[PDB]
């Protein structure tokens, strides 16, 4: 149960500059980023152990993303994963690893949460960049649709009803919530 609120708010300003979000909405969003992080992290670890690797790389994040996410989300996630990893690899450094990856979401904390409790695998540098990029992309997608629902309701901020309606009304988000809340 990491708080991603500040990073969610930054992504919300990127995609709906003039839209707010309610504290109950922000809680659901954090719950959602946690569930997604765990499901992808869990699957990547299993993939490495099954194929008896001693490390989680962006390859195992990539496979996990392709297994868990519906098709269009998976394609955009893979695109955003590879772009963030590539930016970071040729980055100018002298900045947060997130700033090198061109992301708002925190690479360090994703690194920390990929290692904690493992004891059977090391975490590559690309793996947490790829996964932060994917968390950022799926946040942007949810907030885009949630903010569109707030506008239809003539509201200036996102409330829980907007997240519910954006998820039920979008084929891929509705399908994804099957694997993620379990």
């Amino acid at each position: 149960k990491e708080s991603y609120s500040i990073y969610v708010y930054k992504v919300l300003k990127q995609v709906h500059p003039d839209t707010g979000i309610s504290s109950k909405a922000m809680g659901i969003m954090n719950s959602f980023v946690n569930d997604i992080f765990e499901r992808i992290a869990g699957e990547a670890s299993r993939l490495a152990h099954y194929n008896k690797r001693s490390t989680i790389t962006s390859r195992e994040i990539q496979t996990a993303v392709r297994l868990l996410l519906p098709g269009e989300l998976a394609k955009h996630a893979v695109s955003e994963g590879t772009k963030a990893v590539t930016k970071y690899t040729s980055s100018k450094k002298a900045k947060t690893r997130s700033s090198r990856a061109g992301l708002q979401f925190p690479v360090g904390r994703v690194h920390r949460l990929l290692r904690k409790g493992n004891y059977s695998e090391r975490v590559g540098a690309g793996a947490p960049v790829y996964l932060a990029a994917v968390l950022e992309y799926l946040t942007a997608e949810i907030l885009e649709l949630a903010g569109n629902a707030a506008r239809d309701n003539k509201k200036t901020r996102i409330i829980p009803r907007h997240l519910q309606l954006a998820i039920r009304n979008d084929e891929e988000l509705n399908k994804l919530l099957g694997k993620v809340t379990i």
Partner: peptide, 7 residues
């Protein structure tokens, strides 16, 4: 009774 999140 659900106030806006601000940073």
């Amino acid at each position: 009774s659900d106030p806006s999140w601000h940073p």
